[PDB]
Design a protein around this ligand. Structure first.
Ligand SMILES: [Cu+2]
Ligand SMILES: [Cu+2]
Ligand code: NA
Ligand code: NA
Ligand code: NA
Ligand code: NA
Lengths: 720, 718
């Protein structure tokens, strides 16, 4: 007995092409490329024949398949993209069971309270060295699996550790002063409290709003202002910004400007209602979903790899040409790329022990009541792994991508499987190199890049991250920003209205009554690079114009200043893209006697204006609290507990406990295990082109092998 | 009948047989063909075709009718290309016009016997007439004319010919100009060297046993007000030499400190400069794979089975909301013209003409073989002429369409460059996305249309991409690859004694081989008519100001806005932190903002960036070529001002380029402007780039700025 091919396969998630002339189906899904003919005894999977007991049936222009077709074909094994792991890698994430076990163990302390929530539950990372010894030497790591369990007990943070090998609780530790991040149920609470507010309904009615049920709230954190905002330092507070729902699916386009509510999550009450001038809510419909648009014709374009992929995913290990690395997922920072090696003619050479997003911030520049505190720390305050956006197959990533699911703990400590959470795809990136000697045959090779892509969405913005592995050893990291703008409601319809000048002082007027408030997007990446080992030094090479001292007619020459950067404080610096910064290994040279190095480029371009530093006066708290914002390059001594640019508990923090703290003591960076931090940002002055939805804007960073090799890396196997 | 594989392949098509489906798939440029043995029909870009003669399987190989290729591919079901019934006025000189123009000047009595041709080009009709053609379809009422530039021995002469009336309109000798380097100069240089006792002798010194294995390379000598000891009115080239050792890579075998100066009119060496003998590096370093085995890769194809979304009509290209015209020039290569954006039914002007303006690759080493070294690749060598045919599938994706283009060689004969330019669409990530919490997703694909051109001059190969975004943005990227100019040195590793002196001016990248430091400086000439030609240049500098409106913030994010009124102020360093707009102060979007385009001379690069010329302001090259040391320029539209480095930059004594064009500091207020973007890299070498350099890219960008009233990709309203 059977079932409709077309519909089952759509559920399952495969693309389905019918070719009437060839009488042939082409089915695609991840590493599987399938061709089958109605009534044929065999199908084709990645070039390999597969026997069907029950062939595909055409019945009045309708295709029908056996109820096991989908397993028989895709589960077949002829799609070799995924292989199962012999020995579980030591950096594999907590599995659902492990998550479930950690939650039971802490629930069995006498201190657990049922209102408790989990801010993060994550592998406590074994020690770098055993991990490397596992990757390179296969030495089993013999210290036992532990998980970090970070709980929010009302407003207090407790950090618990559990040992899962032995099912026991190793530590339980309240963290004084620390506030927890925003959690999912906070969103509901806030909407709820506003809903139950007689007072709030009144503030709202007198700003033109007749149906309060129509008000969409959104929770922001309050930052820290040494009291100027009038808020007690030791309460769990969030500010609530409001929109009117008009039925166009875009409440973001209907700001109720100049109304703020401060909510005490513990009490579950609005403890304050800041109120300013009444600005009429912008009411014109502004859907971004296409509802009011003509869908034009597009000729199809497909990228296909009909014999399967060049990469192999074994458990979480990915192998691709000379690259090997381990890919996993954290609830706070998303993807983590670990134990990365480059296979040099047989021997795997170390490149990066662990790279991931460090943290990010999007701080605005308008002083008015609904804005002066607006600064999202997306990962740290909202948990970016958790808010991963499933990839939209074929659109969010190219049609030849393979899409992975990933499993993290949610806030109540139940596992959640994120479908299509990270995309992996190879892409053609132009010619790897070329020379066309005059009169001679041409020489050209293709360039191929392996991209790992992850998208996370926080309130209005959507961020995309690409980790790009060039065959020739380069590694790129790019962040793209898209979504909907945080807009300010204003009286001016055009720049000709009386108030336009005042309305547009902190942002562009991007639609009638709507201003795109200026702000920055500052990303930072924590790269624990071990260039061919962990003992590294940071080197500077500054191209300079020196006077010619060798005679002949030139007055000047191009020369370099090479010097070492001996310690943390000197390493925290602006990046001038005119200069070269290497992380060299001073114990290891290439065939020419040069320290094998990677070149570190925090700014390799972008589509928005670039952020030169924090767009804040040096006396702003946000400035005081987050130094990572103002240097492009930082290097610190390896420290397992040092992970976040913004610091570990940044909600309403009062000092810098991130990169400022990590480099406070100004330690030696000479010939020692370093961690690199790249900060890169844009400064976003808006324009109509970005409204009601912003075209994706991109920044790029780059890491390039610098005399890490002896020659053109992609020349090929030597046959002599 | 004729054999299917041999015919299709001679034709340039890609043949795939699929035994499972018993199906052939044939691909070439815009045609995607599906045909089965014995079928009465085929599919061409999704559409059915009756076959005169079915395809026959005769012994596991296939036969087709002798007409098949034409029947099928030129059937009209592949619509990539349509006929141009009314020729765009900027259409390049055809082969016939080239021959006609050569005859006309060959018929003057002033035409001297061995005269050569530096450049034979359309003399474009005037701007307004051409816009009128493209927008209103007005016939341009002007005979087709050509600029004919001649090199008589060493003398430059500009002629203009009227091709319609077949008459010579003018014949101007050009006082003091030197001609660019022409093909046949390469061989003279080589012969002249081969026949020089003196040189054969200088070479034997340096340890070379057979002088017929010595490969010459011709360089322009610059200008040093006599310090180089070279007389000004003589036609000269300096020769650097290498030793051919059979590895196919003479560049890897320099003869250091040996320079010859050749006078091309006398045909002889007029000076040999000789410095310390450095043994020639000998090790075979081929780069063509002769000694390598690529590893086996699974196939990847990018397919457009229903044909392309663009349409090429003669040289006009239509694609989504873009329309524009693509022609080819022997000097600067491709030119993009009469570019408009169809805004909901109305074509709005964006760029009249954009093209490479000029480039330069200047070196940082004072020694005898280098101090003068500086390739002005287009202006001194002719980058169009030296176009490198695109290698299908490799230099461009497997879904490109490859164009042929015609120009005149230095003897005046037409020359068809096969696959001179690639046109291709590509997925470029999501165009926009919002995943609202708890809601259905919204995503659209970004597509870009790319125009790719590759030129190779001596050892560099350069790639240019003109990239049209659906959303109205235009990127322009320049890629650099090929083989480094290296210096022979005694040092083998950084441990040897000479190593430090040896690397004062570059990295030791192989034994005895140093990659001399230099820069790559590209300049793009962009006549933009933002929604019309009457424009002004506007600065917007984001700044941090004190909060005045109250509350806890001490500071705010504000913008300094102001007009840049005149050419000298427009001539400026670019701060990627600031914004620069070419605005149309006469037209505004729905919000009352002037429609504009944001200009981004530096949107990134994979090599370190040059923020200016790496030359003391008193170096002659710095003086001759101002364009190197500012990233943005804007000048008043003038039809004769096209080259940032000047019309005749060979051995020039002043700046006839952008230095001269802004010499008089004219007004840029509400008038026709021409934007010039300079971007460049500072190249410090590494071993990863030897013997062949992985392509490195720089990026620039032109973005609509309040040109539209909203997200331009949303689609039309119902
Ligand atoms: Cu933004
Ligand atoms: Cu270079
Ligand atoms: Na490290
Ligand atoms: Na430290
Ligand atoms: Na113009
Ligand atoms: Na001028």
């Amino acid at each position: 007995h059977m079932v409709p091919m077309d519909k089952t396969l759509k559920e399952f998630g495969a693309d389905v092409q019918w070719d009437d002339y060839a009488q042939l189906f082409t089915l695609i899904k991840d590493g599987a490329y399938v061709k089958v003919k109605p009534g044929a005894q065999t199908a084709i999977v990645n070039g390999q024949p597969l026997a069907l007991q029950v062939p595909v049936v055409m019945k009045d222009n309708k295709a029908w398949v056996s109820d096991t077709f989908i397993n028989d074909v895709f589960q077949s094994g002829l799609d070799q993209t995924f292989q199962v792991e012999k020995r579980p890698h030591p950096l594999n994430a907590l599995t659902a069971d492990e998550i479930k076990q950690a939650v039971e163990i802490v629930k069995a302390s006498a201190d657990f309270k049922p209102n408790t929530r989990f801010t993060e539950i994550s592998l406590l990372p074994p020690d770098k060295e055993a991990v490397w010894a596992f990757a390179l030497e296969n030495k089993p790591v013999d210290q036992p699996r532990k998980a970090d369990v970070i709980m929010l007990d009302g407003k207090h943070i407790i950090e618990a550790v559990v040992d899962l090998q032995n099912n026991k609780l190793l530590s339980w530790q309240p963290i004084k002063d620390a506030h927890g991040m925003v959690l999912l149920d906070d969103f509901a609470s806030v909407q709820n409290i506003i809903n139950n507010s007689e007072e709030f309904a009144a503030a709202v009615k007198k700003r033109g709003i007749t149906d309060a049920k129509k008000v969409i709230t959104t929770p922001l954190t309050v930052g820290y202002f040494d009291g100027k905002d009038g808020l007690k330092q030791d309460a769990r507070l969030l500010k609530v910004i409001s929109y009117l729902d008009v039925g166009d699916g875009n409440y973001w386009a209907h700001p109720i400007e100049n109304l703020v509510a401060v909510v005490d999550l513990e009490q579950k009450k609005i403890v304050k209602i800041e109120e300013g001038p009444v600005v009429p809510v912008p009411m014109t419909a502004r859907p971004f979903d296409g509802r009011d648009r003509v869908a034009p014709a597009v000729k199809p374009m497909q990228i296909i790899e009909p014999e399967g992929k060049n990469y192999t995913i074994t458990g979480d290990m990915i192998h691709w040409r000379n690259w090997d690395f381990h890919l996993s997922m954290n609830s706070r920072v998303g993807p983590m790329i670990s134990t990365v090696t480059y296979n040099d003619n047989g021997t795997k050479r170390k490149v990066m022990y662990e790279g991931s997003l460090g943290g990010m911030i999007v701080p605005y520049g308008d002083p008015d009541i609904g804005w002066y505190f607006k600064a999202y720390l997306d990962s740290g305050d909202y948990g970016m792994g958790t808010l991963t956006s499933p990839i939209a197959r074929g659109k969010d990533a190219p049609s030849n991508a393979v899409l992975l699911n990933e499993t993290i703990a949610d806030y109540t400590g139940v596992p959640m499987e994120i479908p299509r959470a990270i995309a992996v795809f190879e892409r053609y990136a132009g010619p790897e190199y070329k020379h066309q000697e005059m009169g001679q045959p041409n020489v050209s090779t293709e360039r191929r890049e392996l991209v790992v892509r992850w998208i996370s969405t926080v309130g209005n913005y959507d961020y995309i991250f690409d980790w790009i592995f060039h065959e020739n050893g380069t590694i790129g990291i790019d962040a793209g920003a898209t979504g909907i703008e945080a807009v300010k409601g204003v009286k001016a319809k055009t720049m000709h209205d009386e108030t336009a000048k005042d309305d547009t002082r902190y942002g562009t007027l991007i639609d009638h009554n709507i201003v795109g408030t200026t702000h920055q997007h500052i990303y930072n990446f924590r790269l624990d690079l071990d260039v061919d080992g962990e003992n590294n030094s940071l080197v500077a090479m500054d191209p300079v114009v020196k006077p010619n001292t060798a005679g002949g007619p030139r007055t000047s020459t191009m020369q370099v200043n090479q010097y070492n950067i001996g310690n943390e404080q000197d390493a925290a610096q602006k990046f001038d893209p005119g200069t070269i910064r290497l992380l060299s290994n001073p114990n290891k040279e290439n065939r020419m006697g040069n320290p094998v190095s990677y070149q570190i480029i925090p700014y390799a371009g972008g589509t928005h204006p670039v952020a030169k530093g924090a767009q804040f006066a040096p006396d702003e708290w946000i400035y005081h609290r987050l130094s990572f914002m103002d240097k492009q390059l930082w290097v610190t001594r390896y420290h397992p507990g040092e992970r976040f640019p913004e610091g570990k508990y940044p909600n309403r923090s009062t000092h810098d406990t991130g990169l400022g703290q990590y480099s406070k003591d100004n330690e030696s960076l000479d010939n020692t295990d370093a961690v690199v931090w790249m900060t890169t940002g844009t400064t976003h002055v808006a324009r109509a082109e970005e409204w009601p939805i912003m075209p994706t804007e991109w920044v790029h960073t780059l890491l390039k092998p610098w005399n890490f090799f002896d020659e053109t890396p992609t020349l090929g196997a030597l046959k002599k």
